[PDB]
Amino acid sequence: KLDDSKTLPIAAQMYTLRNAGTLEEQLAILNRAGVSAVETVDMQKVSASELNALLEKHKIKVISSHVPIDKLRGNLDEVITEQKAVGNPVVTVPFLKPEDRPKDAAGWTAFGKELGGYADKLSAAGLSMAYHNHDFEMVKFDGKTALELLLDAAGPKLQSELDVAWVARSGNDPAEFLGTLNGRVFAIHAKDDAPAGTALDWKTILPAAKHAGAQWFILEHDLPL
Amino acid sequence: SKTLPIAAQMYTLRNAGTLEEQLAILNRAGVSAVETVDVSASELNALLEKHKIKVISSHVPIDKLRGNLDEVITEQKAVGNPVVTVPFLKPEDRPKDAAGWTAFGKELGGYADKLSAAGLSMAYHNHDFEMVKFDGKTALELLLDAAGPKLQSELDVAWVARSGNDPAEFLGTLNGRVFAIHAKDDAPAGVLDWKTILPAAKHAGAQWFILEHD
Ligand SMILES: [Mn+2]
Ligand SMILES: [Mn+2]
Ligand SMILES: [Mn+2]
Numbered sequence: 426k427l428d429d430s431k432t433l434p435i436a437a438q439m440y441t442l443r444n445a446g447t448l449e450e451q452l453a454i455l456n457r458a459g460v461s462a463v464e465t466v467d468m469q470k471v472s473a474s475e476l477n478a479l480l481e482k483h484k485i486k487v488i489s490s491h492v493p494i495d496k497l498r499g500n501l502d503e504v505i506t507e508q509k510a511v512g513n514p515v516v517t518v519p520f521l522k523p524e525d526r527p528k529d530a531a532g533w534t535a536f537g538k539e540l541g542g543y544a545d546k547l548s549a550a551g552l553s554m555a556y557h558n559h560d561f562e563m564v565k566f567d568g569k570t571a572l573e574l575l576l577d578a579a580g581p582k583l584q585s586e587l588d589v590a591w592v593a594r595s596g597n598d599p600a601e602f603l604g605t606l607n608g609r610v611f612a613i614h615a616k617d618d619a620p621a622g623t624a625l626d627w628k629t630i631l632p633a634a635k636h637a638g639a640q641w642f643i644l645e646h647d648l649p650l
Numbered sequence: 651s652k653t654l655p656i657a658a659q660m661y662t663l664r665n666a667g668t669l670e671e672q673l674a675i676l677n678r679a680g681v682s683a684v685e686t687v688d689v690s691a692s693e694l695n696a697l698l699e700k701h702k703i704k705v706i707s708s709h710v711p712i713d714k715l716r717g718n719l720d721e722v723i724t725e726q727k728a729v730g731n732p733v734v735t736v737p738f739l740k741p742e743d744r745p746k747d748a749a750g751w752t753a754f755g756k757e758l759g760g761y762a763d764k765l766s767a768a769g770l771s772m773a774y775h776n777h778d779f780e781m782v783k784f785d786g787k788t789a790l791e792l793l794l795d796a797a798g799p800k801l802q803s804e805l806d807v808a809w810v811a812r813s814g815n816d817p818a819e820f821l822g823t824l825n826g827r828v829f830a831i832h833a834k835d836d837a838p839a840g841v842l843d844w845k846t847i848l849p850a851a852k853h854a855g856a857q858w859f860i861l862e863h864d
Contacts, residue, residue: 429653440678444667447675450863453835454656454679457844457859484839621680622653623848623859646680649702 426619428458432631433613433642436462436488445475452483459624464517464612464643465490473510480511488641489515489555489586489611494525497543505550515611516547517555517586521562530566530574537578544582555611557586563595570597576609584611586643589630599625600633610634612641621646652852654831654859657683657706661863673701685709685735685860691728698729705729706858707773707804707830709737715761723768733829734765735773735804748784748792755796762800773829775804781813788815794827802829804860807847808837818846821854828854836864 428435437460442448448471455463461484468476468490480487490511496504497518508514518540527533544554556579562572576585585606589599603610613634615625631642658681663669676684685707686694698705708731714722715736726734736758745751762772774797780790794803803824807817821828831851833842851859 442675444665447667447863450658450835450861451675451679453833453837453861454681456839457656457833457861482838617680619680620682621656623656623844624653646678648674648677649700 427615427617427627427642427644428460428619428622428624430627430631430642432635433639434462435460436464436612436641436643438614438643438645439463439465441465441467441470441476443470445471445479448476449479449483452479452485454621455485456483457623458621460485462486462488462641464488464641465511465514466519467491468511469507473507477511487511487514489517489643491519491557492516494518494521497540501543501546505547505552508552509550513551515553515555515584517557517611519557520559526561527571530569530571533562533566533571533574534578537575537583540575540583541579544579548582553584553611554582555584555586557614558588558591560591560595563591563597570595573605576606581609584609586612586614587634587639588614590615590625593625600629603630603633603637603639607637610637610639612643613639614643614645617644617646652849654848654851654856655683656681657685657830657858657860659685659709659832659860659862660687662687669697670701673697673703676703677701681861683858686729686731687737691725695729705731707731707733707735707860709775710734712736712739712743719761719764723765723770726770727768731770733771733773735775735829737775738777739779744779745789748787748789751780751784751789751792752796755793755801758793758801759797762797766800771802771829772800773802773804775832776806776809778809778813781809781815788813791823794824799827802827804830804832805851805856806832807842808833811842817842818850821847821850821856825854828856830858830860831856832860832862834862834864 527536547554558572564571592599592602683704683706687709745754765772776790782789810817810820
């Protein structure tokens with residue numbers, strides 16, 4: 426079970442709701458599962474002060490938050506204000522819609538350089554930055570993945586939220602990929618199929634992750650299709 | 651091993667809140683099971699199977715158990731619910747002395763025997779009024795002991811502790827007679843010593859941790 430692993434501390438991906446009453450049930454589940462940290466999605470749906478009061482009550486910490494690229498492009502100052510309203514989360518690029526995906530190696534380089542500029546401004550405001558990949562960043566140009574192109578061009582203020590299932594599915598070894606990102610990994614992300622309860626060669630991946638500097642194993646439960 | 655699976659007790663729809671939003675929250679929290687409360691079996695089987703969530707318990711009021719039990723059996727089997735749970739007693743239905751709590755346990759034990767012959771199990775969910783004591787014994791122990799082991803406890807540990815009884819120790823008196831632990835979601839993170847409650851619950855044979863939305 427991924428939740429019973431103890432190489433990396435566990436964090437849960439949590440979808441925020443407008444109703445702070447129903448948000449409390451999600452936090453009570455984490456308390457009983459022994460999970461103390463969350464990565465938030467849609468955090469702006471709820472009032473910051475209401476969410477802060479509930480997190481404090483349940484001793485849960487927001488360790489990162491999904492911020493779409495159009496918000497980083499359109500008003501970064503507002504992103505900074507919104508994220509700091511709840512504390513100190515890593516600002517994480519969650520996904521790229523098809524229309525935002527570069528087409529060639531030079532485009533992926535330019536995109537990483539763009540993100541590196543945001544990472545500098547976020548850093549000046551006291552916020553870190555991460556990038557969460559899926560499958561389209563695994564495309565390769567002359568032997569190098571789009572993901573490595575953009576992270577290398579962005580510089581070490583941008584860390585990887587590495588989705589290792591997509592790394593492996595593309596035919597790259599996840600542990601070796603983590604070696605190339607030594608000191609530039611924020612977390613490992615994985616889908617969790619195990620039912621909630623009280624409390625891919627993971628046996629090599631999680632040690633490689635920890636040696637690279639990963640701080641969190643972020644687990645996600647999905648809606649069925 | 652040392653984990654209790656978590657189920658959620660469903661709640662009524664207030665404001666705009668839909669039922670499917672309830673199930674979607676549970677999917678995203680990873681909760682695989684629900685305890686239902688008081689819409690047709692056709693409608694709720696369909697939504698539960700589409701969200702891949704099973705019913706593990708259903709709150710059935712005492713007046714239904716007393717009035718039409720064969721109908722209770724039919725309705726529970728229609729949604730695949732395996733456990734009939736008495737959720738509450740209104741003040742007028744609460745026995746007044748030790749003899750009355752014993753007689754009430756015997757009554758419930760008769761329903762548990764009939765439910766068992768129909769292939770269904772039975773549990774009893776307490777609040778605070780069952781924690782009253784007669785010559786050292788709680789009303790809750792009187793009724794469970796008198797009902798026999800076909801009636802199990804859905805033990806509300808907050809009300810046990812609030813009455814001055816250690817919930818871990820109380821679970822020890824109910825070894826093999828505990829269906830679930832019950833708790834609400836509005837409690838601050840550490841009143842209740844979950845470091846002792848959870849192993850006691852597991853040792854006693856609890857099958858579920860059931861979370862109630864205040
Ligand atoms: Mn992410
Ligand atoms: Mn490189
Ligand atoms: Mn209860």
